[PDB]
């Protein structure tokens, strides 16, 4: 029995390490920057078209060395961010015991359905009520500025902010969040899985770790685990609606081409 709780504790630690090794941004780094003690050079704030063009000239000059409409340039930046996060999540996923042992097609499927849920979960770490860190911690873009973009672009982020304000009130730390992201990835009920029985067991193992970790790490909040279970179902719906919105953009905006990796993830998703 001690051999088991020892392995549960150990597994929680190893997932936390894989998370620290693989993601460029985490909640601790984001709060340092935001606090914001004591980074030498604080984030450029982007709150209107002028500050956006300034940030662009210094932070992604290529995209403006040419130019497309502001809303489209921001959408391109969003995509580049998602592509990089997808790459980070892939490596994190391969560090989870048993993931890399799965059928390549089951791995693809867990990632396909999991990445955007994990992305919006982790996005919360860089969001407060006023805005969100962007460009690897070097800029901060305001919620109001995003809302002010023309339709449909102004509809992208608000729902993510709304999710984040509630997720953030849970006061999770990175050790909590690494496990949550692991449980999102190892999900037995993704559409089209081959070896469902094995993955359900893997899922149950991870959730067991998460449940015990939350018990140790948050003894003040006895309902924390059912709360997270609900957040997972919320993320599922948040992602369904995001993809619906993405399809609308792709279909009606002549100048907003989807990156090929992201089209692959979205294809036949929901």
């Amino acid at each position: 029995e001690d051999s088991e709780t020892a392995d549960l504790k150990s597994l929680a630690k190893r997932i936390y390490e894989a998370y620290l090794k693989n993601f460029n941004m985490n909640k601790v780094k984001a709060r340092v920057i935001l606090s914001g003690k004591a980074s030498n050079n604080p984030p450029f704030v982007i709150h209107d078209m002028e500050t956006l063009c300034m940030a662009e000239k210094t932070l992604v000059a290529k995209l403006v060395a040419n130019n497309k409409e502001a809303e489209v340039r921001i959408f391109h930046c969003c995509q580049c961010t998602s592509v990089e996060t997808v790459t980070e999540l892939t490596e994190f996923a391969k560090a989870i015991p048993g993931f890399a042992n799965l059928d390549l097609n089951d791995q693809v499927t867990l990632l396909k359905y999991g990445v955007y849920e994990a992305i919006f979960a982790m996005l919360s770490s860089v969001m407060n009520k006023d805005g969100m860190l962007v460009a690897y911690g070097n800029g901060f873009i305001t919620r109001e500025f995003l809302k002010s973009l023309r339709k449909p672009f102004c509809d992208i982020m608000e729902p993510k902010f709304d999710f984040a304000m509630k997720f953030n009130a849970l006061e999770l730390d990175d050790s909590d969040i690494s496990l949550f992201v692991a449980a999102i990835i190892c999900c037995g009920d993704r559409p089209g899985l081959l070896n469902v029985g094995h993955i359900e067991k893997m899922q149950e193992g991870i959730v067991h770790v998460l449940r015990l970790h939350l018990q140790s790490n948050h003894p003040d909040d006895i309902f924390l685990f059912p709360k997270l279970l609900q957040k997972m179902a919320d993320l599922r719906q948040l992602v369904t609606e995001h993809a619906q919105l993405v399809q609308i953009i792709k279909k009606t905006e002549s100048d907003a081409a989807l990156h090929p990796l992201l089209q692959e993830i979205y294809r036949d998703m929901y």
Partner: peptide
């Protein structure tokens, strides 16, 4: 063959 398959095999 797919981009995701490639990412998964990348390393």
């Amino acid at each position: 063959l797919s981009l995701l398959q490639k990412l998964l095999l990348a390393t």
